[PDB]
Amino acid sequence: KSEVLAVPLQPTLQQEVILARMEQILASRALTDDERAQLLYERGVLYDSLGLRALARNDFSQALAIRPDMPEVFNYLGIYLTQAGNFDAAYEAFDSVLELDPTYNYAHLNRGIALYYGGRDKLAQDDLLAFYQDDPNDPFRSLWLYLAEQKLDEKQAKEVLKQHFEKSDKEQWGWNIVEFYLGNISEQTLMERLKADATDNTSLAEHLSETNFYLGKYYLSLGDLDSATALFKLAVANNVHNFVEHRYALLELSLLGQDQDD
Amino acid sequence: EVLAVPLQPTLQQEVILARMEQILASRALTDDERAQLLYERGVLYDSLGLRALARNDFSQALAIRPDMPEVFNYLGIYLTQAGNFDAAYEAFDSVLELDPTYNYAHLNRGIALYYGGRDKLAQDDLLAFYQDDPNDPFRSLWLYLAEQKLDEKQAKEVLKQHFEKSDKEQWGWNIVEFYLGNISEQTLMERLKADATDNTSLAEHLSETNFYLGKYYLSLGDLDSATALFKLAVANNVHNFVEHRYALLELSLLGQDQDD
Amino acid sequence: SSLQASQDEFENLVRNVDVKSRIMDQYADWKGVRYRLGGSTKKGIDCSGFVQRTFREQFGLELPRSTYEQQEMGKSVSRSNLRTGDLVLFRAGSTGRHVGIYIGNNQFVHASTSSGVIISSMNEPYWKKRYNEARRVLSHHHH
Amino acid sequence: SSLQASQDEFENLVRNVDVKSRIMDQYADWKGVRYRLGGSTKKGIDCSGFVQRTFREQFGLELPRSTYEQQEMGKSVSRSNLRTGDLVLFRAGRHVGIYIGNNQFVHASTSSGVIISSMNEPYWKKRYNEARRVLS
Amino acid sequence: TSSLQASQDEFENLVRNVDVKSRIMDQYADWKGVRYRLGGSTKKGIDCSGFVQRTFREQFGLELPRSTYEQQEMGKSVSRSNLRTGDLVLFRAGSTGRHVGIYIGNNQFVHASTSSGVIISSMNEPYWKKRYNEARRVLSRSHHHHHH
Amino acid sequence: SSLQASQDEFENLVRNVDVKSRIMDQYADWKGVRYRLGGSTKKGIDCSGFVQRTFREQFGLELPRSTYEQQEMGKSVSRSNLRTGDLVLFRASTGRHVGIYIGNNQFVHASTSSGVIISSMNEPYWKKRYNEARRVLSRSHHHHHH
């Protein structure tokens, strides 16, 4: 509304073809435990990409009951316990990921975020700095690290992020979200930089999912709930269901919701 | 702008979908028992925006039990949604050929003819549908939109009359009051918020309401505002609203217009 | 009742009930049953009492007993557009407003003062003058 | 959040969502069958006979014939917590139905046969006694 | 709305045909590294035509002829830029005079090679870009034989 | 490509391959083949012809021939997250030499002196020359961040 909006993403024909076929194969009895667990895991991922998280979790749970050595299952179970507000069960699920596969790098992030939301900022920083130095030029690694260092002290969280920015190669578009957070560029400027980079609608929807979450967190840090409630909603309205920004925009809205009662 | 949390799949929907898979995977359903279940899963997939899957289930149900006007209905809608208006009219004919008592075909075919530009035939179908429930504001809105193509000033007085000749209860009569010039866009939105209760109720109001404001803005050649109002309709994720289905269609049409 | 809701939903979407024939099961069982104001048994029943037990036992729908409340259930239906299982209604005489259930072909079934529960024609002239309203009480909401 | 229900809460809802469907599938068949004390066929059935038959056919669960003995099955439930498929007991002999949610229950009545009743019918409200949960 | 741009029929046959590459690769999982032996049909050793014949039989239920000369006469001729997964791809060997494999998209095909046994290869490997000849579509959308 | 994208996607999604097992199938078969620069047969092969041929025959994955080009495929990998099937790259007269990690600090490559062999990353010559790694076997993602 005089602002930057995408057509909310819709299920792709590919997603529906693949789900329709999976259902045929899973209905057969010509499947090993091993190849069945695999279809369940991969259908879970698909269901999770359409925002059907109860069904996905259901498939994952069944995949694990057949093939226990599935760090990728435990990762998603952790994520869903985070979105549910069960941070304690979530820490434990990510613990499991890294027992099974120490190389399953992404659980450092996901447990970083679970600790962040669980109010365990020092421990979160431990995991999100680990994550960050595995790929410095990923802007979202520095953004989550900023978010966790923020509550301990706003001032040296920004001096660190500035550090990360200058130290990075500055290619990836997300460094613009960073530039805004530093106060290098306006929010106005961030939004035109956004449209410039964004090609088609899917690209546009990805850019707005990620960006409106980080703007939401920026406004929430100022104590503007009205503005943040809106930016979290516009984030979700892109229907990029499997973005962490999408999932935790939903959690923030849940937290904002419950504050607002009495 | 007034925003809901984009609707998310409910526990009930996911529970039922999960169960329905087990049942359909079992090999002890009579043809009829399976047809009705396929149909019903179809409805549920549609309510989640999974229309290829929905249409696939509907198509298989019809294979088993051919006498299903309810299936031909949806199938017709999906053809409307896909810009396939001639195929759609034909699907809706089949509905009334089996059950002439099936009101909703009149609407859906009404709208298909609207988008097909066969405005007399659409006025026929939408006035048929109006006459069943004079008090359903949306019937009066669709009628107006169809009549608006031929004479917007006359369409506007026959809508005034559709208003006074009604209970004026259901919320969507506020949309109509705005179309009439009785209230501003701002007042309409104040009332929208006042009338809505929980988030689901708010989403439903914003899905219907932003479609109708989208069409208002189209009608003045403001494609920017219309485009945005259509996207904010779709953003509520009320996947089985007429206003949602054809918000996507409008955007598609605006999509091809600009992008040439 | 997170559960009971789903159970209720599932029963609704899985049941494809035959309206006309379930009503006619009721009327089979109840035909000839005497009129008794405020009664609700096979020893005597009035017209709303009969409606209430029909929709309860045949459809699990719970209607109020007051004939006034029964006519503000569902949504109104024009006489053109009548379908089996709609309530038909008639102006109050000395036993209150009258209500029956439509069974198609211009035939309704009702507890009557004169004959007990019987099938009547809408086109019987007693009932053309007295006809008043109909209500449909069977089947994301627009606002 | 759909995900507040745990995975086990979900598996359980999936197992149990069709429990009313199945009682009603019984009812679709049995609907309007006569009363007869000591009857277990479709010519005429009593309250305990209809319950016993439902649990056999729908739940593969063999309950005893008499109402006396069906009171002792499963565990006790209070009104607050009634679920579909719970036995509801009234003083009437005493009398056995099956709760189907929303204050209604299915049963063979002595007067009207296999019907649906409301718990809030005055007759039946003052005669409620206890309930039994018998599904695992 | 543009999964609906595809008709129910196009959808039906996308579902039927989406797993076709995974079925050929299922065959490859089990036959990978099996030696070339001219006239052979087992995991003891197999020729290009036997590997092709067996793949279509086991994966899809499609009877094909034994010899490479009869196979290339099957189905319908396909130009290079219209190749689709499942298409026979024909080269001139000059060991017999004729060599056949199965296209799996992205410029690669599976086959029983004379040198390395059953392998994946590129259509852009100089050796095989020089000896390409034609392509045959023998498998129809409905998994019947393709019309001529 | 709109069928073939679905088909390619479906293959990636069902295939759960034993990555080390497949690499050692190739090594068993190619063990001790000589060094020939620009060669790509069993009469002689260079390090990157060996990689290219291995990922195609064993994983149906199409890599470029150039080592410069192989050093920009997939995502880079820090040394502690190294997995079987990751390309290991070294400053070694080419400037640039590539093998495949196979676990326990071992990698498989075509070397100058010995042809196709397994070496230890700990061998002083290679630890000094270790340069980076790339993951090229990688379940491709639905939506992408910017």
Author numbering:
A (entry chain A): 26 to 287
B (entry chain B): 28 to 287
C (entry chain J): 22 to 160, 165 to 168
D (entry chain E): 22 to 113, 117 to 160
E (entry chain I): 21 to 168
F (entry chain G): 22 to 113, 115 to 168
From the paper:
To characterize the basis of how the lipoprotein NlpI mediated the endopeptidase colocalization near the outer membrane, we determined a 2.8 Å resolution structure of NlpI in complex with mMepS by X-ray crystallography. The structure revealed a heterohexameric complex with a homodimer of NlpI bound to four mMepS molecules. Moreover, the SAXS profile of NlpI-mMepS is consistent with the crystallographic results, with χ2 = 1.73, confirming that the hexameric structure does exist in solution. Surprisingly, the intrinsically disordered N-terminal of monomeric mMepS becomes folded and dimerized upon NlpI binding, thereby guiding four mMepS to form two asymmetric dimers bound to a homodimeric NlpI (namely NlpI and NlpI’). One protomer (mMepS-1) of NlpI-bound mMepS has the extended α1 (residues Q28 to W51), while the 12-residue segment comprising Q28 to D39 lacks a defined secondary structure in its apo state. This segment simultaneously engages in extensive interactions with the h1 of NlpI and the h3’ of NlpI’ located at the dimerization interface of NlpI, thus contributing to the extension of α1 by approximate 3.3 turns and 18 Å. The core structure of mMepS-1 mainly interacts with that of mMepS-2, while the extended α1 of mMepS-1 engages the interface of NlpI dimer. Notably, mMepS-2 of the complex structure simultaneously engages mMepS-1 and one protomer NlpI but not the other NlpI’. We conclude that the colocalization of four mMepS molecules can be mediated by a NlpI homodimer, suggesting that multiple mMepS may work cooperatively and thus enhance the avidity of mMepS-PG interaction.
During cell growth, PG endopeptidases cleave the crosslinks of the fully closed sacculi, allowing for the incorporation of new glycan strands and expansion of the peptidoglycan mesh. Outer-membrane-anchored NlpI associates with hydrolases and synthases near PG synthesis complexes, facilitating spatially close PG hydrolysis. The protein level of MepS is known to be regulated by the periplasmic PDZ-protease Prc (or tsp, tail-specific protease) in complex with the adaptor NlpI42. The structure of NlpI in complex with MepS provides molecular insight into NlpI-interacting endopeptidase colocalization, while the Prc-NlpI-MepS complex elucidates the molecular mechanism of NlpI-mediated MepS degradation by the tail-specific protease Prc.
